[PDB]
Paper text:
N-Myristoyltransferase (NMT, EC 2.3.1.97) catalyses the transfer of the fatty acid chain C14:0 from myristoyl coenzyme A (MyrCoA) to the N-terminal glycine residue of substrate proteins. This co- and post-translational modification is ubiquitous in eukaryotic organisms and plays a central role in a variety of cellular processes such as the addressing and reversible anchoring of proteins to membranes. In particular, NMT has been validated as a pharmacological target in fungal infections, in a range of parasitic diseases caused by Trypanosoma,7Leishmania8 and Plasmodium protozoa and filarial nematodes, and as a potential target for the treatment of cancer. Herein, we report the synthesis and the structure-guided optimization of a series of quinolines with balanced activity against both Plasmodium vivax and Plasmodium falciparum N-myristoyltransferase (NMT).
As expected, an ionic interaction is observed between the piperazine and the C-terminal leucine. This complex is further stabilized by direct and water-mediated H-bonds of the piperazine with Thr197 and Asn161. Finally, the role of the substituent located on position 6 of the quinoline ring was explored. The benzyloxy-present in all the above compounds sits at the top of a narrow cavity, which leads to the catalytic C-terminal leucine of N-myristoyltransferase. Virtually all of the known families of NMT inhibitors interact with the C-terminal residue, which is a leucine in fungi, Plasmodium and Leishmania but is a valine in T. brucei and a glutamine in human NMTs. This interaction is usually formed by an amino group in the inhibitor that establishes a strong ionic bond with the C-terminal NMT carboxylate.
Author numbering: 26 to 410
The structure:
Amino acid sequence: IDYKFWYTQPVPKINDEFNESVNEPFISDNKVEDVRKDEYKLPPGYSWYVCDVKDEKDRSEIYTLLTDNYVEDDDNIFRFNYSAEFLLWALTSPNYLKTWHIGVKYDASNKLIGFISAIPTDICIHKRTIKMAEVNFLCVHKTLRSKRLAPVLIKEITRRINLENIWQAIYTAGVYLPKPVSDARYYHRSINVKKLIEIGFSSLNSRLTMSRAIKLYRVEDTLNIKNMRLMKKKDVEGVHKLLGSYLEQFNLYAVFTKEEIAHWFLPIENVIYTYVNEENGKIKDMISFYSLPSQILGNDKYSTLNAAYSFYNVTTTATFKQLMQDAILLAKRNNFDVFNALEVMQNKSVFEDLKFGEGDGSLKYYLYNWKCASFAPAHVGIVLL
Ligand SMILES: CCCCCCCCCCCCCC(=O)CSCCNC(=O)CCNC(=O)[C@H](O)C(C)(C)COP(=O)(O)OP(=O)(O)OC[C@H]1O[C@@H](n2cnc3c(N)ncnc32)[C@H](O)[C@@H]1OP(=O)(O)O
Ligand SMILES: CCOC(=O)c1cnc2ccc(OCc3ccc(N4CCNCC4)nc3)cc2c1SCCC#N
Ligand SMILES: [Cl-]
Ligand SMILES: [Mg+2]
């Protein structure tokens, strides 16, 4: 493929490979005073719209758009189904700009048909921390694909980001663009296998009967780390230390403030779960996973897949293996059907012993306007929504 849009932009060409020692922007010495002050032109009968995520009604309009039009797997079994409460948590982190939540409406009908979002975060690439935008939730309605709207959405958000004197961005995708800094396979751990078979995702055979399948994915309902409990406000400082120390070994990761810690980890029902082990008034271990349901497309009996996604996990009092077994138990106790993770951080090493299956695709990590060595997913220490 040609990448007629992406080749205009400050990213790598497909054939670009840089040494471990090159770690700089593609275009340095940018200035806010030169950024375009006009909005990008939309085609006839479309308008830019500014979304207020904190208003139930606008938030529901985005929710409606994502429900019907977001990413489907290759085999169209599933469609991501971010909840309304989820979008509120993901779009209102500390210092979020309301102007970085960009909608597009069809004038004749007043209906949202397009969306792109960004929030600010500090990012450490190969030991240099940089102010960045994190881009998420790009979506064009199904009736309007392959009409070159995506680039308008990207250029527009780029423009508004540049106005805040920010010139770098991090994003993830299932698709291949120029060019990933890392590529990680996902892995699934069955919890309610009976459902995973009935919808057609998982398969039986003459060796693995229905009952043998259930027997194999059974977990013991007793935690290895006895005192593991839900995070509370008094745990923010201890979470900040533990996680700030652990993350420093990776090639790519976000630098968290106390404020971001409380925002990203304080538990919220059906959104984000965090557990901690506290001895001596000190936080020595933590487990976290987020809820991302999927719509199960065209199925008589089931409409929703309840899925937990591995977030950040750190142990100092047990093995990583034991910690994640406790994560899987904690997922099961909250009615999740499946536990998903990427081969990032220490995760790869436990997939075989804990009975994870290799999934069908992979998640690519990209930076905008950053030149650097690509690296294996073990060196990736950030998880994005
Ligand atoms: C300094 C600040 C920097 C800020 C900016 C940073 C960049 C952030 C970038 C955003 C990161 C998103 C992160 C994120 O949200 C997480 S990845 C999930 C994105 N969402 C979906 O997949 C939802 C369902 N699909 C859609 O809505 C459409 O397929 C979309 C709208 C994706 C494309 O609409 P369309 O109707 O299918 O296509 P056209 O309008 O005709 O446009 C075709 C052009 O779109 C390029 N394309 C396709 N998919 C892309 C993707 N996932 N990322 C980036 N680019 C993508 C494609 O390569 C082609 O360019 P080319 O001709 O060069 O090949
Ligand atoms: C039973 C186990 O399977 C699942 O839980 C599930 C649910 N909904 C999806 C919806 C779309 C999909 O397409 C491939 C894909 C496409 C993009 C993507 N991203 C992009 C950026 N944001 C989140 C992850 N992740 C996966 C796969 C899926 C999958 S499996 C593949 C990846 C995951 N999780
Ligand atoms: Cl227990
Ligand atoms: Mg289009």
